[PDB]
């Protein structure tokens, strides 16, 4: 079986828990790791190369009070770093998370996600999002509550880890229905801004 430990980090309140919980089977089959206060969510995705499982490590909030213990990071094979696009400070803390992660895990594949893009009053915009370009990281706007771009971080990571640029998901996993609407007009614009910013340097 093909599985990877995926550590999910970022400032408290960025929506890491909401995000991982979108995946319904991941939620029903999650395992509690008492020693570390961690819930591990097995997220299966079906690709043209077979099933791939991301065991996503989600905190129980300890990140609000300081860095995470080494055991949390140990043996991680990939990661997502999340910040809140409606909170400049969460973006500002991103470098710290990268540092801590990399001190333990090194050059593992990492996706940077700006969450909560369903919100009209957006603080951290595409042209300000620059950390990923510096460190080799891929970026995606996401909205956990609307399922927007939910699958993109996992697809990029699967491609990187298997070493197959043509890897595809045969179908989307069963997800919790969108709690908020992600405006299609918005999603169109936010995608344009990102593209342009990526060609800005």
């Amino acid at each position: 079986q093909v599985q990877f430990k995926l550590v999910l980090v970022g400032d408290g309140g960025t929506g890491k828990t909401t995000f991982v919980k979108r995946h319904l089977t991941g939620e029903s089959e999650k395992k509690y790791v008492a020693t570390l206060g961690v819930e591990v969510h097995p997220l299966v995705f079906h690709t043209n190369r077979g099933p791939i499982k991301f065991n996503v490590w989600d905190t129980a909030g300890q990140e609000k009070f300081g860095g995470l213990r080494d055991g949390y990071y140990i043996q991680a094979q990939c990661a997502i770093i999340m910040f809140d696009v409606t909170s400049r400070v969460t973006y500002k803390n991103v470098p710290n998370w990268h540092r801590d992660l990399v001190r333990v895990c090194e050059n593992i594949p990492i996706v940077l996600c700006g969450n909560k893009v369903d919100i009209k009053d957006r603080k951290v915009k595409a042209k300000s999002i620059v950390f990923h370009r510096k460190k080799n990281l891929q970026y995606y706007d996401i909205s956990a509550k609307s399922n927007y771009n939910f699958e993109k971080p996992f697809l990029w990571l699967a491609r990187k880890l298997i070493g197959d640029p043509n890897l595809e998901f045969v179908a989307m996993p069963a997800l919790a229905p969108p709690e908020v609407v992600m405006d299609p007009a918005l999603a169109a614009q936010y995608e344009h801004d990102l593209e342009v910013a990526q060609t800005t340097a």
Partner: peptide, 27 residues
């Protein structure tokens, strides 16, 4: 000799009498 941890699913070596990540015993 490697074993998967029943508690957190991390793959460990046989030389480890408990999980490098969560410290859980090897079955």
């Amino acid at each position: 000799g490697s074993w998967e941890c029943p508690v957190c699913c991390v793959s460990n070596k046989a030389e480890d009498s408990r999980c490098v990540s969560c410290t859980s015993e090897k079955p």
